């Protein structure tokens, strides 16, 4: 009762959303080095035995349609679910290429009551994105 | 025999609420490169929260920003583990 069951036939999906290039009309800059992240993550989770799907330069609509589609997949033979979001952000918000999308909206597709083949199974959301504009000055 | 619909989520955030997150233009973001390094070294031994705690320490102690803009120079970062998990998680 103390450890999640990870001996299903499959570890699960690892969806990587790597947004690098944003519509110039958003004013947001290109995220240099993110491709090194998305590749590092792909090799990492392949060694952990996840089925990894890399997706690049998705609009807010494509991020929502993707997440909706994946959450309606049959995860019954999967142990877990991982989703990596690499993008600009503000508190509670991740940016597609063309504008903002709330995180609570992405993750709600995987609620216990809405993704029933993932009820009781760990759902990992790894979020590389800003959460505001404060800066940590540090202490010696 | 119900469980809450918000249970069994873990949100590994790269930075604290309200803060900037840092990325290096050649090496990738501090959080992700530390996450992958720690997963490679410990996913076969440590529980996942302990791995994420080692990511926390690594980002916090081994990275400091270098910027030609004094406003953005010598800044630090701590990641933010947010668990509504009900059980321990081993990748082995």
């Amino acid at each position: 009762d103390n450890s999640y069951k990870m001996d299903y036939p499959e570890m699960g999906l690892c969806i990587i959303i790597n947004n690098k290039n944003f519509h110039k009309s958003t004013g947001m800059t290109s995220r240099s080095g993110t491709d090194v992240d998305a590749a590092n993550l792909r090799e990492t989770f392949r060694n952990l035995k996840y089925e990894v799907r890399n997706k690049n330069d998705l609009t807010r609509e494509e991020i929502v349609e993707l997440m909706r589609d994946v959450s309606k997949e049959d995860h019954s033979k999967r142990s877990s679910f991982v989703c990596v979001l690499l993008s600009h952000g503000e508190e509670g918000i991740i940016f597609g290429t063309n504008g903002p999308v709330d995180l609570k909206k992405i993750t709600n597709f995987f609620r216990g009551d809405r993704c029933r083949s993932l009820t009781g199974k760990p759902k990992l959301f790894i979020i590389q994105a800003c959460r505001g504009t404060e800066l940590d000055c540090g202490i010696e | 025999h119900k469980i809450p619909v918000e249970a069994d989520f873990l949100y590994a955030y790269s930075t604290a609420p309200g803060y900037y997150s840092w990325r290096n233009s050649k090496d990738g973001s501090w959080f992700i490169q530390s996450l992958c390094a720690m997963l490679k070294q410990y996913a076969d031994k440590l529980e996942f929260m302990h791995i994420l705690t080692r990511v926390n320490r690594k980002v916090a102690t081994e990275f400091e920003s270098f910027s030609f803009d004094a406003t953005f120079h010598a800044k630090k970062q701590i990641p933010c583990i947010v668990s509504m998990l009900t059980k321990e998680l081993y990748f082995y």
């Binding site: 240099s32 080095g33 600009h88 | 840092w22 990325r23 290096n24 050649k26 270098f66 910027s67 953005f72």
Partner: peptide, 5 residues
């Protein structure tokens, strides 16, 4: 160069 997200 270190940049912000």
């Amino acid at each position: 160069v270190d940049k912000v997200d």
